[PDB]
Design a protein around this ligand. Structure first.
Ligand SMILES: Cc1cc2nc3c(=O)[nH]c(=O)nc-3n(C[C@H](O)[C@H](O)[C@H](O)COP(=O)(O)O)c2cc1C
Ligand code: SF4
Ligand code: SF4
Ligand code: SF4
Ligand code: FES
Ligand code: FES
Ligand SMILES: [K+]
Lengths: 432, 45, 87, 214, 263
């Protein structure tokens, strides 16, 4: 009744069993990979069965949400209320570090659309609007090949996988705005409006895209669905600890030996994972400065604390960092951390929509004062001010991008304070 | 026939056309189950 | 948009003539009572002052707001036309 | 310039002639068919993308044309044009160079990618080459930070670039030859240099986890 | 009935379901600070100035668009609500150009009076600012877009009320600008109304511009005659002559909007 052997998960347990597209990445080899088999029957068996399978599995918001799959699927099962319920799968993946999903749409796009049809039965809906990013035009065509055969055999559309249920999904391209990855900025892009994040209520279960109920789930939720429903939610939940269980794609990346996309088991000590994933941090963990296993909207953790932490959603936030999409970015001693957040805050400045004020001029302010940090035109008090400023932009924003702006820089203030202290002290010291 | 670990089966990542998405979409228009009527032609209508 | 001024009744009068000064051009007036904006908590107290020193007076009703039925979920809809094109 | 206001340019103003091709006319009919009736304004995003790809950059006369055929107010489709990143409001070169210099990709020494490309072209980041081929603008990642440094060229992005490799592929593009996009190594997408931790054993077949009437 | 009792900051009052928090606050008399919300206009929830902390919650609730629940204590004067108020208020005011003596909104500016009550007493900004190109539309309304706080009230009062597509929000982030992109001249019959809805001097009246200021004017109310409607209006005599016309609120005849030919 225990799984102390956290780690060492093989390809047969990875949800995207062909995440590198080595053998017939399309659905033609996927029906030989397990999915599309016995799929309409579990679909027709029960909408609450579908959420039961995802609840027994227990995937929680691996696309930076921390929300259990069972919870968001269960809020949906309300009977058809005339307005046409849909699904929407966030495939923007524009966060710096989020690239594991970009690989699987090129390699496992079948489970993307198969997860929609089985997941879509859970609310009794009729169609869906997968939002693959504009830079992912190659991904979009790969979905299109996957969806055409699904339409042709009835797997998607009317008679879903041969069950008589009418459920489809239209693949539409993006325009490379990272904000459109927000669960609320996603709505406007689908219905043809500037991607300015909306507010809740109305919730996805209530008015959403086109003013009707529609799930806005990540790549994983549909992608895992064929694997954690037919093969078994208990099979996935067998790996991993309580709540945070199973395996997720790890985006070991950054200045590391072998930056790869590995779907190793989750809820594992982070130490030996990225020590074995990319053959270890390039130059070693000793030469390493700070790995960020959550990605952009996640606090950087200093090298010493990276040596002693588990990467699950619980344990990482115990270390005050986020895990989000498991975008494991590595950055070592040679590069200066203030320069790291320099490019990070610059990305946030170019992705804010300016809808809500605290993010609009706020993310502008972080870049400006941090720009002084990099050269060193500040004072130790100004470090406190930017932390105080980061407190003000925390929470007060419409969406979590402003909150997502705080987490990386806020972690710096608590963790790499002396590194910032020497950064702006040197500028004035040798200026005189 | 069997699984091979040293091929880029997704050569589409390297070869495509200028219009890829929509010529496949006009093919998608074949099934494209009819969408529910909203009554009005648009919010202004 | 502030509202913390429409809460009191006031005693104000009729405006007499305002002839420009032969010099630089100040608005010379001979209406001593014109600059007599008083304050009143309620109209009943307002008329009480008016009748106590009997003065030719008229009434006016307190401008009362109406109920703004606001629903942010309405701003997005499927068969309802209150959908907003830009926030 | 990043000036989001129309300064009534002599050529790219309403006087510009725009015509959807009859092939594109039925193609955009398919775009409209994708979205439900009563909300057909949803096509302001892809039809504008068609209007761009049809005429290289996206002309303003297209922005006026797309307004009426999609029965939307002009200001609305202007908003889509002015926000959604690339959406070139001004004329763009043949190869829309999008240098990914964001933090994970910058940490992998994409800086040398930016400056060497900017230097070998001579032109600064921004304006296009005199032969209207390459126009380089620093942008954030296309979605491949798992991969080594990355640059989006024209409509295609190259991965696993090297401070030496990135020049070679694009001077080939300058000379007309078109190298294939993707990682510029044995890496198909991002496989580890040491080995293949993922997809080493054959994938599972059918018939797994049969829960009674599964 | 279905009326729901809510213990706003103590005192408990019933209210119809679906009613947002502001209507509950003003039901008592709590004038909650707001910029992007006007009574007869769609909700934006953008300024984040009406952020007030609700009891038993780890996050500050956006009172603008949020409906009220079965029993809630609106922490009006709590430190968390005031901290949220202070953070966003200096945020709007940060990039605001230093032209209060120049801008006509002086003395009738929400951004001014709100900072007096709900505001700091100093600054913490050390960097530069952002200046916006002044969009030129109309010989009747003046636009100083550097002063705009992007509350988008103009665009909503345009598309919903005037029913005409005139203004946009071109740009993105700090560089997103309210305007027409391509140059135009917004021309509605009620075009002279966005001047009053504008919380700042971003949009002002050209003829009245640089002519008179609040404390000089002695407002006198009357009705419009240019139309058979008879719109209630406010006259702005300063020293023996009329400066500007304000649309007195009465609902039935004209609400608080008057057409150009009357103002
Ligand atoms: C600032 C921000 C950016 C996001 N960007 C993306 C993105 O690019 N792609 C994506 O799939 N989800 C993105 N998300 C996550 C979505 O908001 C949302 O969690 C998703 O639709 C459902 O995730 P889940 O299925 O893990 O619950 C982002 C979230 C935030 C707060
Ligand atoms: S926080 Fe930023 S991205 Fe989110 S709504 Fe506000 S301005 Fe837009
Ligand atoms: S709008 Fe701006 S410049 Fe004008 S009075 Fe108000 S704060 Fe001052
Ligand atoms: S111009 Fe005025 S009304 Fe319009 S968004 Fe700016 S501040 Fe608001
Ligand atoms: S980091 Fe270079 S592609 Fe996103
Ligand atoms: S007034 Fe409620 S958010 Fe702007
Ligand atoms: K104004």
């Amino acid at each position: 009744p225990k799984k102390t052997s956290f780690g060492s998960l093989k390809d047969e347990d990875r949800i995207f069993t062909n995440l590198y597209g080595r053998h017939d990445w399309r659905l033609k080899g996927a029906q030989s990979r397990g999915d599309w088999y016995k799929t309409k029957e579990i679909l027709l068996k029960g909408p609450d069965w579908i959420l039961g399978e995802v609840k027994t599995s227990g995937l929680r918001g691996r696309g930076g949400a921390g929300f259990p799959t069972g919870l968001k699927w269960s809020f949906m099962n309300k009977p058809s209320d005339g307005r046409p319920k849909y699904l929407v799968v966030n495939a923007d993946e524009g966060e710096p570090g989020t690239c594991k999903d970009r690989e699987i749409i090129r390699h496992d796009p079948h489970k993307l659309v198969e997860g929609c049809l089985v997941g879509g039965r859970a609310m009794g809906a009729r169609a869906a609007y997968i939002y693959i990013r504009g830079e992912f035009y190659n991904e979009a065509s790969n979905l299109q090949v996957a969806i055409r055969e699904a339409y042709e055999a009835g797997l998607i559309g009317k008679n879903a996988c041969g069950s008589g249920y009418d459920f489809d999904v239209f693949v539409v391209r993006g325009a490379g705005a990272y904000i459109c990855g927000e669960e609320t900025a996603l709505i406007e892009s689908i219905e043809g409006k500037q991607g300015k994040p909306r507010l809740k209520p109305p919730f996805p279960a209530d008015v959403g895209v086109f003013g009707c109920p529609t799930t806005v789930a990540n790549v994983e939720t549909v992608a895992v669905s064929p694997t954690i429903c037919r093969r078994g939610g208990a099979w996935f939940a067998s790996f991993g600890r309580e709540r945070n269980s199973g395996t997720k794609l790890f985006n070991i990346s950054g200045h590391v030996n072998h930056p790869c996309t590995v779907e190793e088991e989750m809820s594992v000590p982070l130490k030996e994972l990225i020590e074995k994933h990319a053959g270890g941090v390039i130059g070693g963990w000793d030469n390493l400065l700070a790995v960020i296993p959550g990605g952009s909207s996640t606090p950087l953790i200093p090298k010493s604390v990276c040596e002693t932490v588990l990467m699950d959603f619980d344990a990482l936030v115990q270390a005050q960092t986020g895990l989000g999409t498991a975008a494991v970015i590595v950055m070592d001693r040679s590069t200066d951390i203030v320069k790291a957040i320099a490019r990070l805050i610059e990305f946030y400045k170019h992705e804010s929509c300016g809808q809500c004020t605290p993010c609009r001029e706020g993310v502008d302010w972080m870049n400006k004062v941090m720009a002084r940090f990099v050269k060193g035109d500040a004072r130790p008090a100004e470090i406190d001010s930017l932390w105080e400023i980061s407190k003000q932009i925390e929470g007060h924003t419409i969406c979590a991008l402003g909150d997502g702006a705080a987490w990386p820089v806020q972690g710096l203030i608590r963790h790499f304070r002396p590194e910032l202290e020497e950064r702006m002290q040197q500028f004035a010291l040798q200026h005189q | 026939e069997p699984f091979d670990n040293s091929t880029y089966r997704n050569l589409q990542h390297h070869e495509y056309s200028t219009y890829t998405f929509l010529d496949l979409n006009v093919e998608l228009s074949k099934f494209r189950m009819p969408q529910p009527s909203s009554g009005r032609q648009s919010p202004r209508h | 948009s502030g509202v913390n001024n429409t809460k009191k009744w006031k005693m104000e009068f009729d405006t007499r003539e305002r002839w420009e000064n032969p010099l630089m051009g100040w608005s010379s007036t001979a209406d001593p009572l014109s600059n007599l904006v008083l304050t009143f908590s309620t109209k009943e107290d307002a008329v009480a002052f008016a009748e106590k020193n009997g003065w030719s007076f008229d009434v006016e009703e307190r401008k009362v707001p109406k109920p703004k039925s606001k629903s942010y979920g309405a701003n997005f809809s499927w068969n309802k036309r209150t959908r907003v094109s830009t926030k | 310039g990043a000036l989001f206001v129309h300064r009534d340019t002599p050529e790219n103003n309403p006087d510009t002639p725009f015509d959807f091709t009859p092939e594109n006319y039925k193609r955009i009919e398919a775009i409209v068919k994708n979205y439900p009736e009563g909300h057909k304004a949803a096509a302001v995003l892809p039809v504008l993308d068609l209007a761009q790809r049809q005429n290289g950059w996206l002309p303003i006369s297209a922005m006026n044309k797309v307004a009426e055929i999609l029965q939307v107010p002009p200001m609305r489709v202007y908003e889509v044009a002015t926000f959604y990143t690339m959406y070139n409001r001004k004329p763009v070169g043949k190869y829309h160079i999008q240098v990914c210099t964001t933090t994970p990709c910058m940490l992998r020494n994409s800086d040398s990618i930016l400056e060497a490309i900017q230097k070998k072209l001579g032109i600064k980041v921004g304006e296009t080459t005199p032969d209207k081929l390459f126009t380089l603008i620093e942008v954030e990642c296309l979605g491949a930070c798992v991969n080594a440094p990355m640059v989006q060229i024209n409509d295609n992005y190259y991965e696993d670039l090297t401070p030496k490799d990135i020049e070679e592929i694009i001077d080939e593009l300058k000379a007309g030859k078109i190298p294939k996009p993707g990682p510029r190594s044995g890496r198909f997408s991002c496989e580890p240099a040491g080995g293949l931790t993922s997809l080493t054993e054959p994938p599972k077949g059918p018939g797994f986890g049969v829960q009674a009437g599964l | 009935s279905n009326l729901i009792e809510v213990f706003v900051d103590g005192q408990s009052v019933m209210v119809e379901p679906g009613t947002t928090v502001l209507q509950a606050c003003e039901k008592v008399g709590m004038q909650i600070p707001r910029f992007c919300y006007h009574e007869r206009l769609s909700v934006a929830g953008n300024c984040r100035m009406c952020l007030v902390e609700i009891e038993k919650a780890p996050k500050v609730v956006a009172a603008c668009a949020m409906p009220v629940m079965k029993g809630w204590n609106i922490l009006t004067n709590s430190e968390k609500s005031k901290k949220a108020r202070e953070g966003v208020m200096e945020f709007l005011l940060a990039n605001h150009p230093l032209d209060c003596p120049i801008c006509d909104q002086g003395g009738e500016c929400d951004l001014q009076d709100q900072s007096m009550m709900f505001g700091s007493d100093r600054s913490r900004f050390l960097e530069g600012k952002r200046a916006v190109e002044d969009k030129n539309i109309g010989p009747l309304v003046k636009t100083i877009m550097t002063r705009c706080i992007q509350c988008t009230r103009c665009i909503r009062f345009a598309s919903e009320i005037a029913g005409v597509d005139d203004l946009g929000t071109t740009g993105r982030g700090n560089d997103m600008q309210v305007g027409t992109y391509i140059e135009k001249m917004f021309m509605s019959e009620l075009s002279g109304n966005i001047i009053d809805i504008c919380p700042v001097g971003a949009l002002t009246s050209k003829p009245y511009a640089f002519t008179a200021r609040p404390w000089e004017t002695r407002k006198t109310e009357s009705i419009d005659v240019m139309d058979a409607v008879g719109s209630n209006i406010v006259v702005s005599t300063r020293t023996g002559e009329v400066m500007r016309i304000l649309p007195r609120m009465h609902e039935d005849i004209n609400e608080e909007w008057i057409s150009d030919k009357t103002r």
